[PDB]
C-alpha cells in the first residue's frame, strides 16, 4: 500500500532485549497505509537504528518494535513536519 501521510500519537508510555515497544494510533483517513519509520541523531540527521517489526502498516484508524541506536536519538513515526519524533536515550554499550 501507499505510505501514511498523516501523523501518529502514543497510546501509552514507550516500553523498554534492548529494543523498545512503541504503541501508536493513526490520525489520518488514508488507511490501509504503510507506517513510515526512520531514526535520527541529536542534530536531526539520518542515524540508522533497526526496525524489528517486519511490515508496520495501519489497517484501520499498531505495535512498533525497534532497537534505538546507542546514546541520543530521535525515533521518527511518519514523514514531514507532522511526523511524531520520540527523543530517546539509550545507555551504554556495557
Amino acid at each position, epitope marked *: 500500500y501507499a505510505m501514511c501521510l498523516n501523523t501518529f500519537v*502514543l497510546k501509552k508510555e514507550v516500553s523498554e532485549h534492548g529494543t523498545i515497544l512503541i504503541k501508536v494510533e493513526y*490520525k489520518g483517513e488514508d488507511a490501509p497505509c504503510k507506517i513510515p519509520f526512520s531514526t535520527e541523531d541529536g542534530q536531526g540527521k539520518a542515524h540508522n537504528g533497526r526496525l524489528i517489526t517486519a511490515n508496520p502498516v495501519v489497517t484501520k484508524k499498531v505495535n512498533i518494535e525497534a532497537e534505538p541506536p546507542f546514546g541520543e536519538s*530521535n525515533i521518527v513515526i511518519g514523514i514531514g513536519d507532522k511526523a511524531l519524533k*520520540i527523543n530517546w536515550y539509550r545507555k551504554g554499550p556495557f
Partner: single-chain antibody
Amino acid sequence: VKLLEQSGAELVKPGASVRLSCTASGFNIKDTYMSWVKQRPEQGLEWIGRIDPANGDTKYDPKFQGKATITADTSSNTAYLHLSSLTSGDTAVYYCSRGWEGFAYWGQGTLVTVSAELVMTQTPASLAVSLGQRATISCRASENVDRYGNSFMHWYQQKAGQPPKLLIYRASNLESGIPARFSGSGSRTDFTLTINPVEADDVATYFCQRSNEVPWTFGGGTKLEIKR
C-alpha cells in the same frame, strides 16, 4: 464506530456511595489509558485520575484521594468510577475519557445529583472578541510538560450541554475535522491557542491540559463571547 457509553443519571442521598460505568465499544479498553473528569455546574474540568487496564495501575489527583476509586473490567470492556461518602460538593457531570496525547474520545457524561504539584494558569478567564478578529488564549504551567522532547499540551472546546471536544494535541497538532482558523503553539512552560478569524460558532469555553506526567491537570478555562 468508536464510542464511550456512560450509565444514566444518578440521584443519591448524602453520605451514600455511587458507581458509574463507561462501556467502550469499537476498541480494546487495554490499548490506552482511561480517565475520569469531574465538572461541577458552570465550573471547569477536573481530572480525577486514570487507569491503565492492561496492568490495573491507577493514578489520582491528590484532591480526589479518599473520595474517588477507578477500576476496569477487561472481560466487559468497561471502566468504573466509585465515589464514597457523597456530599453536595460531589454534585457534577462525570465524564470518562480515552487517551494520553489529548482526549479525542469522551463519554456523554453522567450527572450525579446529591440530594439535600504542577499549577496550570490559563488566561483570560473571560474573553470578549468582535467577529472576524483574533482571539488568543494563554496557558502557563508551573513545571515542564515535556516528554520525549514533545510538549504534552492539549486544547479543548466545550459548548453548552456538550462534552469537551479535542482541538489541539501535542501543543501544535490540529485534530481531524478542526478548521484551519484554530492554531496552537508553545514550548517549555508557555502555551497559546489562537482562533483567527473568530466566527459565531467559536462561542464556547476553552481548556488547556497537560498529560506528560500525573496529575493530567486542566487549566481553569476561558469563556469566549462575541462583542460588537
